[PDB]
Amino acid sequence: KVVSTDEYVTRTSIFYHAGSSRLLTVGHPYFKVPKGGNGRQDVPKVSAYQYRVFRVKLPDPNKFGLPDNTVYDPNSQRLVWACVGVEIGRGQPLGVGLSGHPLYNKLDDTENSHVASAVDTKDTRDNVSVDYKQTQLCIIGCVPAIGEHWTKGTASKPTTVVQGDCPPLELINTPIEDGDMVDTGYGAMDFKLLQDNKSEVPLDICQSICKYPDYLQMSADAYGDSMFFCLRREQVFARHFWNRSGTMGDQLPESLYIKGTDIRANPGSYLYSPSPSGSVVTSDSQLFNKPYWLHKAQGLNNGICWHNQLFLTVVDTTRSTNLSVCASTTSSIPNVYTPTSFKEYARHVEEFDLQFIFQLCKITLTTEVMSYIHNMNTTILEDWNQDPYDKLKFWPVDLKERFSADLDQFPLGRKFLLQL
Amino acid sequence: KVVSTDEYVTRTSIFYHAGSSRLLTVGHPYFKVPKGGNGRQDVPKVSAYQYRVFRVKLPDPNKFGLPDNTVYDPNSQRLVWACVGVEIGRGQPLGVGLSGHPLYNKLDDTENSHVASAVDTKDTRDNVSVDYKQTQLCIIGCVPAIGEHWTKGTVVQGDCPPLELINTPIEDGDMVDTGYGAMDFKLLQDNKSEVPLDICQSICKYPDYLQMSADAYGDSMFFCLRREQVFARHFWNRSGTMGDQLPESLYIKGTDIRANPGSYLYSPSPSGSVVTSDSQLFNKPYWLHKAQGLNNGICWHNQLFLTVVDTTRSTNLSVCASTTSSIPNVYTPTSFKEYARHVEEFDLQFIFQLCKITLTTEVMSYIHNMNTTILEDWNQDPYDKLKFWPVDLKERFSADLDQFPLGRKFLLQL
Amino acid sequence: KVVSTDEYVTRTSIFYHAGSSRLLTVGHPYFKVPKGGNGRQDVPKVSAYQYRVFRVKLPDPNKFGLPDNTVYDPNSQRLVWACVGVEIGRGQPLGVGLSGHPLYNKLDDTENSHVASAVDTKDTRDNVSVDYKQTQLCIIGCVPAIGEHWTKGTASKPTTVVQGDCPPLELINTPIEDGDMVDTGYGAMDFKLLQDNKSEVPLDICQSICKYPDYLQMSADAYGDSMFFCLRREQVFARHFWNRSGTMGDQLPESLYIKGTDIRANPGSYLYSPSPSGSVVTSDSQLFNKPYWLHKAQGLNNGICWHNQLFLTVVDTTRSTNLSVCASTTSSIPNVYTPTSFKEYARHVEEFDLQFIFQLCKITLTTEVMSYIHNMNTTILEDWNQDPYDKLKFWPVDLKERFSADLDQFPLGRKFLLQL
Amino acid sequence: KVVSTDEYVTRTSIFYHAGSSRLLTVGHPYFKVPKGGNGRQDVPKVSAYQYRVFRVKLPDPNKFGLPDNTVYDPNSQRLVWACVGVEIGRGQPLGVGLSGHPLYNKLDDTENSHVASAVDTKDTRDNVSVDYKQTQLCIIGCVPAIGEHWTKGTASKPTTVVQGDCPPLELINTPIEDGDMVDTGYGAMDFKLLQDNKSEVPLDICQSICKYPDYLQMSADAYGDSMFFCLRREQVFARHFWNRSGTMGDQLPESLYIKGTDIRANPGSYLYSPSPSGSVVTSDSQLFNKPYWLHKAQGLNNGICWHNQLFLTVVDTTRSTNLSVCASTTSSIPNVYTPTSFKEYARHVEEFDLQFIFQLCKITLTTEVMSYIHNMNTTILEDWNQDPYDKLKFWPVDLKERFSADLDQFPLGRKFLLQL
């Protein structure tokens, strides 16, 4: 069986505040722009529609500064940090941004239209931009969050795959790393694998993977180490209805229509995919800059940071505005406007101030306890007396020296004392 | 008379958790795509706008594992499962999808337009896609839910048939109200071009809430949840000759083309305003205390019937594979095969309560008049003909609710 | 003076349930379609935008089945039914429907337009359909509800009416019958009288009367027999702005504009009337399928069904979807689609399940009581020891044998017992 | 100092009901239509976007019918009416209406457009109609409400005004009379003075004044006689963006743009004014037909009707629907539709049922009291032992004989008794 942490983890009256005074990142909202030559000289991909996963390292409480005997006996007890309060600070103003692709596969407007039949022979595809689905989600854990997405699979029954035939779809669970693209309205799938077209979705996700947090997985998790706090708010509607150019792989059955004459001999394309849009960014529906207290977690783990690691996974598209930087090619400002004498750039911005309230805890290593902890993680006892997340990409947030005792001084700290 | 179950069914302090760890289904969002040759090699119709009806089988409590005497005396008492808690897990992200028909009967825009008069001689019908009406409904019962829809009822060829309303069991796969109403599109539309492909030849059923509540024993439904929104996006005109003659007493005849007036068959395109997680109806634990019917969460024959509709996750996937093994340097739309695939994810969770029924003589004379089979199977299924999603939980029952998400939520609720 | 019913009407612990198991009606959503030849062979006008007024007959409690002495002495007391609970069941799914008129008087788009000047010489009117104003209202009474609308009047001061001149407008109170058209956004008036054009509003109301419930009247009513329960929710906005073709009867004063040249010598038409629309049908704003308990009425009458008559007046446009029935002219399904070989029909549907909870009451006919009841209705005492509503059109709902004692069995009945 | 009325005005247990059984007015929604010849024979301007200010006269309580000694001694005490309850009845159904002007100054669509450049040489102005800003406001007082608007002023520093130059703007406080135009979205100003164009705004306000209630004034008022109850709800958004034709009086600085060639040598017009619109009329946001109880007023005056005068100022655009009346020029209904043989008329309608609940009060005229009342209004003592509002236009509502003692009988009366 698996047992709650409230059983074998004794809490104390010790409280601490920690926070990265400010976090910032700047770059291109679509793709990584290299300038090479050579180190470093380049611009990273920073979009409002990608996961921000902060690996937040906490100081070893057993080796913590000013270690007194009055707190714990290190012959039967070890110390562990437990999360109680979190306030995710968003710095930038609320905005709405665009994502697009010059060669967006769009046959013709199938919503309400009239003018153009756009017969499928060339690519009557035009240039399309669009605002994605508004998504605000938050996840805290001692283990990186788990996501889901669809990827090319293989024959359920062993038949030779013909080139052009549709591949079967397999659902894959993957750790949500800093940088991974979120659900942008076009679904959660590998656009690099399932779209050889390279023209179905806007540039930012065109060759990336869209992951959605497998909430069903992280909750049904045994120990619940993955997530123990959760917040989500997503809205989306169909702005415009379109048709996909290309030859249909599935033949539209004659038993669903009466064949017309003219061009209506063989019916038009039936591949309909609409353009998504987040109705409106409002601060009423805002999900951050607010203090969130953690009493009871969903999982049997109750806010406990094993190995002193906290994993904050967050998505915020409410601040998705993009910046247009225009520099002239000539050093003197041209008296006449010529569009060729101006270099235009696309830059995006994301600001953060992470705040935390932890609670020091004692664990008396009774013999039945160690036989439980050992079966959970062999490493916890090992590091008490090789990291598996080395391969993964997180935003490092070192708080080993950001821990402050007196909560009076800090904004979240005061909010916590009031809460008591 | 009919009596409540709280009278003749004694509840216990025994509680269990059960759940299908994950349910998934994939296919085409419009029609069943065969590839034949021969078994199986084909793709099923999986749309966000069709009923998902799970037939959930529960283990026989009278023959349940570790059967002790301390629970019930099997000479006067039998055991029966009762539902208390349910959390329907939706797995996929919220999305908006499209449904359409290349030969959609659409004369001309009668909302606000100007350019085209589109005189009725040919089919000036164009290609139309649209997003359906957003609908979230949930139903739990020991008997499959009941739906309603309209079906064809000397008849001259071409004349309008009368309309009859029919009650039918809601099976897994049946199409829901998509905004174009609840009717048999295969029967009442010889046109084969009035509504999008997915419902074009299927039946749209709506749950007869008035029926299932006015039901005597209330075996059909005992829990209910519904939220549906829709508005008219665009206004159109239907091509074809009107069967009902527009009376001259309703207009003053103009000249030109306005001698005999234009078509008056107006049917708009539906749309769900916006999918928002604020209005979301699932992934939430739903506790069941008092049911609407006299049956109070009792799973007779150990059968639970969850009928559910969810269009909040209606996004469709576009899969594009090139016809050439090498990725073409130049884009030619003819060298790419495009496919339409849809996805639906589920995690069903339950909290049951073991119950005792002391078979007093007046009790059996009541149960026998309700279902002759309940006593029969205690000491041929009528739902064999129907299509449900089988969810076997005969070995998913776990005693300690500690371990499971819904289980913990239930213990807290106490 | 007028006195409350709680004074002279003694309530009991007797309760009953009644309900029409299901009510249905089908027909054309615009006009009555005859087929003649001869009886009956025709289709009635059934629109979502017309009043449904159920005349609900209740069994005579004084002559009620199983009449025992233990209830009332029929030498000083009479029995009367009193309404306590009501649940109006709507059967069909929520939908949005259209109403229109092929020759809709529409000069040109005056909202935002550019292309057409549409000079007034012919009828540049096109074909217009539109969705009406969303309206949900409910009324219960022992007397048919009272409506209001505008109708052609006459000279306030006796001047001979010139043909073409505008008639004065008179406001008329009328009993709301089953079938009368509601406020559809174009106002409450007699379209048959005030519009000789026969082309100002869609077909369904084109020649009918739009009535709105005179709430101010029915509440200020003395006894309050008209309404004693009330529910209303209506929403509407201007979708498109238009101009009315035709010669203005009121001359636009030169003191309101500076005359331009060209066509702007004499200004264009100023008759602006927009197209209405119900923003969105949502079940959040739904008003029916919900149990409504009646404790204190607004009028001095408190849920009392005099003469054992209940009048439910209801409007519901949330279920306004229309059905398109298409039958081919040829017995064999044509391989080629020819629009002339298909007969198209317009059919609309409305479903109802009415439910009630009544409370038996005693009235001791003291001498001062009869001198009050006689001055209210001479007929109440008369029928206790010719109907005036014979001339009016109601939907008859006979419940003389639908009264059931044990509320256990029925949905509304259980809801009522719980409420206690 | 100024003292509250709760101090020097003794309340009683006497209560009365009063109400104008129904108020109605009909006319043209844009301008006053004369027919002359001679008395009266004309149609008044009745728009949904103009203030309705009812001057409500109350019977002199000191000279009130059945005056008994048991109530007050008329040698030290005088009687005065105090308002407690108000329910403003709106009669007509909710609707959306249009206002426009055939020669509306509109250069070209500057929102999203493409086709026309519309070079400023003529008046490329077209015909424009629009729905105004939705506004519901309510005000009760013993003195007419105070409004604000902008009007042509003069040189702050004495410079000779050149013809064509922009006049300075002065803000003016004015009494809100029955008929004055409200804020319709185009602001609060004198359109007759600041727009010599006669083509900037729709006809109804084109030559009238738009007043907005100076809430800041009426609250900061000493005695608070102006308003003591207040209710307001207004919504508006920009439907379409446009450009104003005409030569700019302020020269667009070269330091704000880079001069292009072609037509972009000297930049286009920069006078942008959008078209307003009330998103949607819903009965959810409805503000009237509801009983409003008055306990504590905002001003030191607490619902006291000095001189027995109540001033109800109200605005309601939720019922702004307009009626189209069409009469044929020929006595026989023409078989063929000719747009020239039909006279079209524009008529608007407004319905009211005002209801009140008053409380008789005593004022013992102590010597220190009269030295306070005299400094407030010399007339109050004078009329107790020439009207200044003769010059102003109000809707007279005489209630000198509408006062009824027993609140039992009336809708608002019952609502008030329940409230106790």
Task: Write down the domain spans for chain B.
Answer: 1-414
Cβ atoms within 10 Å of C37's Cβ, excluding its own = 7
- Peptide bond before residue A322 is cis, with ω within 30 degrees of 0: no
Closest CA to D275 of B381, C274, A68, B394: C274
D257, D258, D263, D264: best mutation site toward chain A, by most A Cβ within 10 Å? D258
Closest CA to B343 of A183, C244, D40, A39: A183
* Alpha-carbon span B329 to B319, nearest angstrom: 19
* Alpha-carbon span B116 to B239, nearest angstrom: 14
CB contact under 8 A, D343 and C103: no
How many Å separate Cα D148 from the centre of its chain? 11
Closest CA to A146 of A123, A120, A174: A174
Structure tokens at C107: 């000069």
Could you tell me how many helices (H) and strands (E) chain B has, helices first? 6, 20
How many Å separate Cα B293 from the centre of its chain? 21
A160 in contact with chain B, both atoms CB, cutoff 8 A:
no
User: Which chain A residues are within 8 Å of C129, Cβ to Cβ?
Assistant: none
Element (H, E) at A274: none
Give chain D as a 3 state SS string.
CCCCHHHHCEEEEEEEEEEEEEEEEEEECCCCEECCCCCCCEECECCCCECEEEEEECCCHHHCCCCCCCCCCCCCEEEEEEEEEEEEEECCCCECCCEEECCCCCCCCCCCCCCCCCCCCCCCCCCEEECCCEEEEEEEECCCCEEEEEEECCCCCCCCCCCCCCCCEEEEEEECCCCCEECCCCCCEECCCCCCCCCCCCHHHHCCEEEEECHHHHHHCCCCCCCCEEEEEEECCCCECCECCCCCCCCCCHHHCCCCCHHHCCCCCCCECCECCCCCEECCCCCCCCCEECCCCCCCCCCECHHHEEEEEEEECCECCEEEEEEECCCCCCCCCCHHHEEEEEEEEEEEEEEEEEEEEEEECCHHHHHHHHHHCHHHHHCCCCCCCCCCCCEEEECCCCCECCHHHCHHHHHHHHHC
Which residues does residue C209 pair with via DSSP β-bridges, in sequence order? Answer: C190
D38, D41, D98, D328: best mutation site toward chain C, by most C Cβ within 10 Å? D98
Distance from CA of D322 to the nearest CA of C (A): 7
**In this complex, which of A108, A133, A169 lies closest to B341 when CB atoms are compared?**
A169
CB contact under 8 A, D336 and B258: no
* Alpha-carbon span B243 to B160, nearest angstrom: 7
Going B357 to B362 to B364 to B367, the CA torsion angle's sign is negative
Q: In Å, how far are A84, A360, B215, B409 from A10, measured between CA atoms?
A: 14, 9, 54, 23
D261 in contact with chain A, both atoms CB, cutoff 8 A:
yes
- Spatial CB neighbours of D50, under 8 Å, sequence gap ≥ 6: D179, D180, D181, D182, D204
D408 in contact with chain C, both atoms CB, cutoff 8 A:
yes
- Spatial CB neighbours of D126, under 8 Å, sequence gap ≥ 6: C113, C114, C117, D104, D106
Place of tokens 């003794």: D10
* Alpha-carbon span A292 to A87, nearest angstrom: 6
Place of tokens 């009256």: A13
Distance from CA of A378 to the nearest CA of C (A): 52
User: Which chain C residues are within 8 Å of D129, Cβ to Cβ?
Assistant: 110-111, 241-243, 272, 274
Distance from CA of A136 to the nearest CA of C (A): 24
DSSP string, B265-297: -B-PBP--S-EETTS--SSS-EE-SS-SSSS-S
β-strand pairing of D210-213 with D181-182: parallel
List the single residue in B with minimal CA-CA distance to A164: B323
Structure tokens at C367: 């001498």
- Spatial CB neighbours of B405, under 8 Å, sequence gap ≥ 6: A219, A220, A298, B87, B349
* B315, B344 Cβ separation under 8 angstroms: no
Element (H, E) at B413: helix B405-413
How many Å separate Cα A261 from the centre of its chain? 50
A171 in contact with chain B, both atoms CB, cutoff 8 A:
yes
How many Å separate Cα B396 from the centre of its chain? 25
Place of tokens 């008369």: C382
* Alpha-carbon span C36 to C26, nearest angstrom: 18
A264 in contact with chain C, both atoms CB, cutoff 8 A:
yes
User: Which chain C residues are within 8 Å of A258, Cβ to Cβ?
Assistant: 333-337
DSSP string, A85-133: EEEEEE-SPPB---EEETT-------SS--S----TTS-----EEE---
List the single residue in C with minimal CA-CA distance to D333: C196
Residues in chain D: 420
The half-sphere exposure of D349 on its side-chain side, counting CA atoms within 13 A, is: 24
The residue ranges of DSSP E strands in A296-341, in sequence order, are 309-316, 322-328
The four Cα atoms C299, C303, C304, C309 give a dihedral, to 10 degrees, of 110
List the single residue in D with minimal CA-CA distance to C182: D93
* Alpha-carbon span D161 to D138, nearest angstrom: 41
The four Cα atoms A383, A387, A389, A392 give a dihedral, to 10 degrees, of 150
* Alpha-carbon span A230 to A298, nearest angstrom: 9
DSSP letter assigned to residue A197: T
* Alpha-carbon span A203 to A212, nearest angstrom: 19
- Three-class SS of residue A328? strand
List the single residue in B with minimal CA-CA distance to A133: B95
C215 in contact with chain D, both atoms CB, cutoff 8 A:
yes
* C311, C387 Cβ separation under 8 angstroms: no
- Three-class SS of residue B173? coil
B252 in contact with chain D, both atoms CB, cutoff 8 A:
yes
- Spatial CB neighbours of D7, under 8 Å, sequence gap ≥ 6: none
* Alpha-carbon span A29 to C321, nearest angstrom: 44
* Alpha-carbon span C6 to D159, nearest angstrom: 78
CA angle in degrees (0–180, nearest 5) for B215-B216-B221: 45
* Alpha-carbon span A167 to C19, nearest angstrom: 57
B112, B250, B252, B255: best mutation site toward chain D, by most D Cβ within 10 Å? B252
D256 in contact with chain A, both atoms CB, cutoff 8 A:
no
* Alpha-carbon span C236 to B231, nearest angstrom: 13
- Spatial CB neighbours of B412, under 8 Å, sequence gap ≥ 6: A296
CATH code for the structural domain at B1-414: 2.60.175.20
CB contact under 8 A, A235 and B94: yes
Structure tokens at D90: 């709106």
CA angle in degrees (0–180, nearest 5) for C235-C236-C238: 165
DSSP letter assigned to residue B234: B
CATH code for the structural domain at A1-420: 2.60.175.20
* B405, B85 Cβ separation under 8 angstroms: no
Report A:84-123 residues touching B (Cβ under 8 A).
103, 108, 110-114, 117, 120-123
Q: Which subunits count as partners of chain C given 3+ CB pairs below 8 Å? A: A, B, D
DSSP letter assigned to residue B92: S
Element (H, E) at C184: none
List the single residue in A with minimal CA-CA distance to B279: A235
Structure tokens at B149: 């829809």
With 0-12 CB in 10 A as exposed, 13-18 as middle and 19+ as buried, what is D6?
middle
With 0-12 CB in 10 A as exposed, 13-18 as middle and 19+ as buried, what is A29?
buried
Structure tokens at D79: 């009687």
- Spatial CB neighbours of D125, under 8 Å, sequence gap ≥ 6: D103, D104, D105, D106, D107, D199, D245
Closest CA to D41 of C163, C159, C250: C159
Going D211 to D213 to D217 to D221, the CA torsion angle's sign is positive
How many angstroms is the resolution?
4.0
C273 in contact with chain D, both atoms CB, cutoff 8 A:
yes
Structure tokens at C33: 């379609």
- Spatial CB neighbours of A100, under 8 Å, sequence gap ≥ 6: A127, A128, A129, A130, A202, A203
Adjacency order of strands within the sheet including A210-213: A169-175, A146-152, A210-213, A181-182
CB contact under 8 A, B244 and C349: no
- Based on C-alpha coordinates, what's the Rg of chain D? 26
Q: Which subunits count as partners of chain B given 3+ CB pairs below 8 Å? A: A, C, D
- For this PDB entry, the determination method is X-ray
D271 in contact with chain C, both atoms CB, cutoff 8 A:
no
Closest CA to D94 of D353, D279, D281, D291: D281
* D73, D10 Cβ separation under 8 angstroms: no
**In this complex, which of B277, B324, B338 lies closest to A233 when CB atoms are compared?**
B277
Residues in chain B: 414
B326 in contact with chain C, both atoms CB, cutoff 8 A:
no
